Design a protein around this ligand. Structure first.
Ligand SMILES: [Zn+2]
Ligand SMILES: [Zn+2]
Lengths: 309, 125, 309, 309, 309, 125
C-alpha cells in the first residue's frame, strides 16, 4: 500500500513532505498517461454545502476522468439536508454510506474532521470555512513541481492579503516541510504574514523577508503566488491607495528570470492585469487546469492500494 | 494664448478634458519635441490657467496679443478642480448623476466635494 | 475528416447547406443505430448560465448516450462564478481546461463567440440571449428531414410571433439555404416576419406570402411551425382579440396532407389545442426528443474526424 | 435670525462651535419646556433610502412633537423610486417640492450634498454612507452638555473601533472645536484613531493619548464613549482574543467620577455589559432619546428665524 | 353643494368638463391661499397595494396640507391584507370603515370601482392597473391651466408611447371635453395613438394630426407632453434606432413660443435631456409639485360641501 | 503622412480613438480652417487608412517621403472596424470583457461580430 491508501484528507497539517511529493509525482504521471478506469465502478459523493464552481467542476472532472461516477449537490441552497434540527453528522452518515469516497465543502470549520468520524469511507476536505482547502495547496504544489522540476530550494514570493489569505498559509506551510525555500512577502503593512506562520517557518529553518514592491524581488524569484486584495479589511479611501502597490502588470515582469511562473488561486479581478496573460510567465490558467490532475492523484492514491502505472 | 513645457503624452489629455477644440477659433497642437498648444483668438484668466496644473506640473503659459508675447503666466495648484476628474470612490453619489465633479486641493491631496473622502493627487489620474 | 471536426458551433449563419445535411444525417444514424462509445473517455462541460431545462436535459442526455461524462451547472445563481469583477472570459478559460468540449447557454448576446476565443476546446452555443440558438434550429431541421424525407422543395407555414421569434428567423434562414421551399406566414399585422429576413429570402430566390388564417393554407402545407404568441407584446384587449386566429385545433387540420407534421419549439400553452396531440400530425414531442439526437450529432462531428455506422 | 436659518445641514465640519452650542441649547429648551406648534402647518419629508429605524423614529418623533407632518419612506426596496435610469437628483427635485424640509438617509457618500443642490427647501443629512451623520454627533454633544453642564474642558474616553468609527471621528472633531478637552483612546492596535484625525487635534491644541485599558483611565474620565467593535474587522481567533479588554462592566466603573456618563451610539451587543445599565453612569438610552430633541432643535432653527421660550 | 361633494373619483370618463374646470380652479385657489384646516379632524386612508412613491407622497402631503391625518400602507409587500383566500371587497369594507375617505392604488383594473361599492365613504382611484389614474390627469390639466390661463383652444403635442401610454389617453380624453384643442401626435409608427381614442376625438370634433419629429411642430405648440419610450414593446435593435427621434433636448426648443411648457408625468430617464431643465419651457418638476394642489382640491371638493375660500 | 479634409470637431476624435499621439515620432494637429493632422516618421497601409473613413467620410490622405508628396490615398469604407466604437447593444457580451470591439460594414450599417445585431452607421457614433 501507498501511505495514503484509505486515508482521510482533512488538513495539510497531517500530510508529510513525502506524501506531498508522491501526490505531485502521481499528478504528473496521470497527466502524462491518463488511467481512465482506475475508479471504474466507484461512486464518489461530491457534496458542496457551500458553492465552489471552479473546485467542484475540478473534482467532478477528476472523478469521471478516472472512470468513476458522481452523486451529490453544488450548494446547500437546493438541499433538504441539515435543515431545522438535523445534524451534519446524520447527513454524512447517510450520504457517505451511498458512496466509496466523500468529497465535501462546508462553511463551518472542522466540518471535514467531523465528516471523517461519521463516514466509513474516506473523506476529502474540499474546503471547511477559513480552516483548510488541501487540494488547492496540492494543485499549487503540483504546478510548482511541474514548472520548476522540484519543490526544495525555490525562491517563492507571496503577494496581496497575507494576513487572512488561507491559501498562502497552507502553501507556505506545505513548502516549509521541504528544504531551503526562501519566502518573499509582499503585502500591505496591514496584511503582513501572521506572527504564528512566521514562528512555524523559524522552527522549519526557512528564510523569509518582507519587501515593499513586487518589482523589487522579481529577478530573484521562481514563483510569484498572487492573491486578491479584498476591500473588506479596509474602507474605500484605504483600498484605493493600498491596491496600486500590489497589482501585477506585464511591465512588472520585465526583469523576470525565464523559469518565473505567476500563480493565482483564482478568481483574479484586477490584481493581475490582462496583459500578463500572454506573457511567458502566466501559469494561473494552467494552475486551474492542474486542479484536475492533483485531485485525480489524491482520489487515486486514497482509493487504490497501488498505482500500477 | 499658447501653453508651453507640457509633458509628452499628458498634453493630448488637456485638449480632451478641457474641450479646447470646441470654439470656431483656430487651435494648433504639436506632440513631442514635450507637447505644445496654441489657441487663436480666445481669452483665459490666471485663475482658469491653473486648472491645467494638475496634469502638467511645471508648464509655461504665454499669451499672444499682436503677434508677440505680452504676459507669461506660470501655474500654481488652484483651490478647486471643477469637472476634470471622476471621483475614485466607487460608491460616491457623483457617479450616475447630473453633477459636476469637484475636489479641493490640500502631501498634495484631492478632497471630493461630495463624498468628502481624500485621495493622493496621482490616484485621481 | 468531416467539415465540422474541431469546429465551434456558434451561429446557424456559419453552417452551410452541406453541413446542415451532414448534421441531420448523422443525427439519423445516432437515433436509429446508436453508438454509445463515440465519446468514451470524453468529458463534456455543460454550463447553463441562464436556466434552460428542456435544452440542458437534452444535451446532457446526448452526451451520456454517446458515452461521455458531464460536468457543469444549471444556472448562475446556484454558482460562485462570474461574481464581481470576475470576467466571463476567465471563467471560460478555466472550465474549458476541464473539458473536451464546452456547451454553454448565457443571457448575453455574443457569449458563445467570446467563449470560442478563450477556449482551446470546441464550444457549442446552447443559446446566447436574443442572438443564436443553433441546436434548436438543428433539431427543427432534423425533424423536418426525418418526417419529410427531404429538406428541399417543402411547403412550410410559420405561425405566430414572426417578428421576435428568433427560432423562426433561423429556421427560415436555414431552409433558405435549400431549394424550392415556399414559405407561408401567419401572424398579426404587428408580428410580421422582419423586413431583413425577407430580403435574405429574396436574395435566396425563395417564395413567401402572408395569409390571414392557418386553415386557408393547410391543404398546401407539409410542415406547420407554431411559435408562441406572447402576452407581453400587446396589452390585454389586444391579446384577447388577436389570439383567436392563431390557435391551432384538430378541426384546423381537417384538410391536412397526410404527411403534414405540426411542430412547435415548446413550451406551448393555449396556442396548440390538446386535441391536436392525438392527431397523426402532432410531432412537437417527437421534435423535442430529436433535440437529443441533433445535439449528439453535433457533439460527435465536432470531436470525431469521421463517424461510422 | 439664528445662523442656521434656512441652512442645509450636511456635515459636522460645516457647523461651528457657536452653532453647535446654539443647537444643544435649543435642544435643551425643546426637551424641558416643549413647543408643540413650532412647525404648525409645516410638512417634513422623511426619506430613508437606507433603513435606519432608531434614527427615523427619532426624526419622525421630533417632527410631530413640534407640530409638523411627516411624509416619506423607510427604505428604497419598499419604493418605486430611483429605479433604472431614474436619477436621485430627479427624485429629490420632486419630493422636495412636497415639503418644507427634506430629511434623508442614503447608502452613498455625498447624497445629502447632491440633495442640497436640487432642493429649494432645506435638506438635513440623516446619514450618507460612510461620510457624515451630523445629527448623531449632535445628540452625542447634547447628551454630554446636558449631563456635564459644559462642553469645554471635559475628559473624554473613546473606546473600541476608533479607526472606522465614523461617529467618534465627528464627535472628536466637534469637541475639538471647544477648549481644553483631553481625549483618551482605548482600542486594539489595528483599530487606532486615524492619523488624519490626530493631525486635526494637534492643529487644534488638544491633548490625546492611548491607553491599554478602560479601567486605567476611569478615575480621570467625565465621559466614556463606547463604540461597537465589529467581527468583520478580523477573523475569529483575533476577535475572540481582542474583545475581552474592550468590554465595559459595572466593575470597570468602581472608581468612576460621580459625574461619569457612559455613552454608546447603539446598537450594543456584548460591548457594554447588562450590569452597567442599573449603574448611575449608564446614559446610552437617555442619549438615544436625546436624538429626538437634537433633531427638533435642528429642524426648528432651520425653519424659524428666531426661537422663543 | 359643489357637484363633486361625496362623489367617488374612479374614472376620468365620469368627470365632466365643468367638474374638471372646477377642480383646476380650486387647485389654483388653494395654491394661492392654502386652507390648512379644511380636513381638520378628518382621517384619510391611503392604501397603495402597488407602490407609487411620487403619487403616494403627493397625496399624503395634500391630506396633511389640509389638516387631515393619514393611515394606510405603501406596498402590498408588507401588508397582511388580501392574502390566501381573503377578498379585496372585505379588506376595503374594513379599512374604509376606519376612515372618512379612501385613496387607493391597485394592480388590477376595476379595483377602484369595486372599492366604491364596498366603502361607505368616498374613494379616490390613485390608480387601477392599466385602466385609470385620474389625479395624474387632473394634475396635468391644472398645470396646463396654470401656465396657459385656460383649457380650451390649445395646441397640445403628445410625444413617445401613444399606443400603451394611459396618461396621454386620459389627458387627450379630458382635453377633448373642452373646446377646440388641436392635438399633435409624435411617436413611432409602432406606437401610434390607438384607433379608438381617435374615433372619440372625431366624435368630440377635435383636430389631430401625426408628425414625424418633435422639432417640426414646436413653434406651433403650447404644451409638449413627453412620455417614456419603453423598450419592452421592441427589442434592442429596434429601441436603439427608434429612440433617437423622440428625445427632447435644449436644441429642440430653439423655435419655441414663450408660453411653451414641457410636461412629463415622470420619471424621465433620457427622453428629456438634462439640458432642458434650465430652459424656460421645462414644467415637469412644477407639474409634479402641482400634484399636491390637484389632489388637495379633489379631496377638498369631495369632502366639503363648499370651499368657503 | 498627413491627413487632409477632416470635418472640424470630428478630427480631435481621430487622435483619441486611434491613439496617434503614442509613438516617440512627432505629431502635429490644426483644428478649424476643417481639422488636419501631420505624422512625422511613421508608415500606414491603404488598408489601415480606411479605419478612419467612419468619422471623416470624404478625407484626403497624402504622404510625405522626402519633403513632398509621393502618394495620395483616398478612403473607402473598409470591411471591418476593429476596436474603435463600443457596441450600442447594452446586453452585448463585449461590454465588461477583455475583447476588442468589431463590426462588419454592410443603407450603410454596422454589424457586431459578437451579438450579431445590426446598427445604422450614425447610431454607433
Ligand atoms: Zn466622491
Ligand atoms: Zn454587440
Amino acid at each position: 500500500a501507498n501511505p495514503l491508501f484509505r486515508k482521510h484528507i482533512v488538513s495539510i497539517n497531517d500530510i508529510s513532505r513525502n506524501e506531498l511529493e508522491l501526490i505531485v509525482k502521481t499528478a504528473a504521471k496521470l497527466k502524462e498517461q491518463p488511467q481512465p478506469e482506475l475508479l471504474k465502478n466507484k461512486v464518489i459523493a461530491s457534496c458542496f454545502f457551500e458553492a465552489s464552481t471552479r473546485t467542484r467542476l475540478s473534482f467532478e472532472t477528476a472523478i469521471q476522468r478516472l472512470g468513476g461516477s458522481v452523486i451529490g449537490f453544488d450548494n446547500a441552497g437546493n438541499t433538504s439536508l441539515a435543515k431545522k434540527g438535523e445534524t451534519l453528522a446524520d447527513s454524512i452518515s447517510v450520504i457517505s454510506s451511498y458512496a466509496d469516497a466523500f468529497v465535501m465543502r462546508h462553511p463551518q470549520e472542522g466540518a471535514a474532521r467531523l465528516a471523517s468520524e461519521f463516514s466509513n469511507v474516506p473523506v476529502i476536505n474540499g474546503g471547511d470555512g477559513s480552516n483548510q482547502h488541501p487540494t488547492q495547496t496540492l494543485l499549487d504544489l503540483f504546478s510548482i513541481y511541474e514548472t520548476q522540476g522540484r519543490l526544495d530550494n525555490l525562491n517563492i514570493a507571496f503577494v496581496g492579503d497575507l494576513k487572512y489569505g488561507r491559501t498562502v498559509h497552507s502553501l507556505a506551510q506545505a513548502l516549509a516541510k521541504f528544504d531551503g525555500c526562501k519566502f518573499h512577502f509582499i503585502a500591505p503593512d496591514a496584511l503582513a504574514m501572521p506572527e504564528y506562520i512566521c514562528d512555524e517557518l523559524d522552527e522549519q529553518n526557512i528564510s523569509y523577508a518582507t519587501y515593499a514592491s513586487i518589482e523589487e524581488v522579481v529577478p530573484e524569484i521562481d514563483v510569484l503566488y498572487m492573491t486578491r486584495v479584498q476591500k473588506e479589511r479596509f474602507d474605500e479611501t484605504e483600498y484605493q491607495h493600498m491596491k496600486a502597490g500590489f497589482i501585477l502588470s506585464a511591465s512588472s515582469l520585465v526583469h523576470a528570470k525565464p523559469n518565473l511562473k505567476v500563480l493565482h488561486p483564482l478568481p483574479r479581478v484586477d490584481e493581475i492585469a490582462t496583459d500578463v496573460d500572454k506573457t511567458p510567465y502566466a501559469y494561473y490558467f494552467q494552475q486551474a487546469e492542474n486542479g484536475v490532475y492533483a485531485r485525480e492523484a489524491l482520489l487515486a492514491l486514497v482509493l487504490n492500494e497501488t498505482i500500477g502505472e | 494664448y499658447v501653453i508651453d513645457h507640457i509633458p509628452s503624452g499628458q498634453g493630448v489629455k488637456i485638449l480632451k478634458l478641457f474641450s479646447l477644440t470646441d470654439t470656431k477659433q483656430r487651435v494648433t497642437v504639436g506632440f513631442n519635441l514635450k507637447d505644445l498648444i496654441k489657441v487663436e483668438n480666445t481669452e483665459i484668466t490666471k485663475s482658469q490657467a491653473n486648472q491645467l496644473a494638475l496634469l502638467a506640473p511645471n508648464a509655461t503659459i504665454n499669451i499672444i496679443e499682436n503677434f508677440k508675447v505680452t504676459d507669461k503666466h506660470s501655474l500654481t495648484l488652484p483651490n478647486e478642480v471643477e469637472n476634470v476628474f471622476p471621483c475614485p470612490n466607487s460608491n460616491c453619489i457623483t457617479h450616475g448623476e447630473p453633477v459636476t465633479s469637484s475636489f479641493s486641493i490640500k502631501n498634495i491631496g484631492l478632497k471630493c466635494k461630495y463624498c468628502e473622502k481624500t485621495f493622493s493627487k496621482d490616484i485621481v489620474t
